[PDB]
Amino acid sequence: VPFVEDWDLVQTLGEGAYGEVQLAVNRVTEEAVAVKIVDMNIKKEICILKMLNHENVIKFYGHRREGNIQYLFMELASGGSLFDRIEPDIGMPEPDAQRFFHQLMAGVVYLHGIGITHRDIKPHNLLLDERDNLKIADYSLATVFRYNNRERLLNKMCGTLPYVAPELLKRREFHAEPVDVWSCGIVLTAMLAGELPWDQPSDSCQEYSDWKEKKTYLNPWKKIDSAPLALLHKILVENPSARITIPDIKKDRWYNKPLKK
Ligand SMILES: Cc1cccc(-c2cc(N)nc3[nH]cc(C#N)c23)c1
Ligand SMILES: [Cl-]
């Protein structure tokens, strides 16, 4: 029964990095959107949200400040998240994963091209519209890494441990783009295996060591076809200057393989 101007807030869709997200339905027009509700940084997020115009990125409709509360209106994803399409221990059919991967690269290339890094790519932040088109959501941790054509290195630790690149734990400062590439590799592994490969990409983690020693006879790798696995070997490369860039992912064999379910 709460509402904001013309919109009713009809049900909880969940919680992003900060605040709650509600399904908002217009009393008059019946249009449904999503609204993020924040209490009591948000200037930055709004500035970034207003830049976004791409089919694989959630669009921002505008915002309203009432009291303590701030309302950020955004495109609704009626298909829910990618997380809900990944069957545990199985993943999803390779052709569906490939399609979602293409769309995730289109969104990330968009962001990077406007000098924005997302910093928390994972299946919970990758939403689906009614045609199962992927949309990258939640810009609460997003920031500028290129401005006036000059790159700025990042130094703040943020993200989600299983998805975070190893440099972010080991370096005082690091480049933004290879960190988002790495997390897209972990997404791809989740999609193809229904399991995350490691708790964190650190020296104390045995599963990460196993991967650096190429023990791909272990899970999750043994579930993945050699062709996508060859791509994962180029993405999940410890040294970020040696790691594959997006332009070269677009040249990969698996990426360009015709697939149908
Ligand atoms: C990251 C997140 C958490 C909770 C809900 C949502 C969300 C769910 C949905 N069905 N559509 C949405 N559109 C923008 C959302 C955001 N943020 C969003 C997204
Ligand atoms: Cl998973």
| Cα 26 to middle of ligand 2, angstroms | 35
Q: Between the CA atoms of 261, 251, 202 and 140, what dihedral angle is there, to the nearest 10 degrees?
A: -80
CB of 21 within 6 A of ligand 1: the answer is yes
Residue with tokens 């993020």: 36
Atom 3 (ligand 1) nearest CA:
16
Q: What kind of experiment solved this structure?
A: X-ray
* Segments making up each domain of the chain, as ranges: 1-87, 88-261
CA distances from 160 to 5, 11, 101 (A): 35, 26, 19
Which CATH architecture is the domain 1-87 placed in?
Answer: 2-Layer Sandwich (3.30)
Tell me: is residue 194 an annotated ligand-binding position: no
21 Cβ neighbours under 8 A, 6+ residues apart: 12, 13, 14, 15, 34, 35, 36, 37
DSSP letters along 18-33, please? SSEEEEEEETTT--EE
Active-site positions read 120
Helix (H) or strand (E) holding 133: none
Resolution of the structure in the document, Å: 1.5
Report which residue type is found at 192: L
Class of domain 88-261: mainly alpha
| Cis preceding linkage at 220, omega within 30 | yes
CB of 75 within 6 A of ligand 1: the answer is yes
φ/ψ of 241, rounded to 5, equals -80, -20
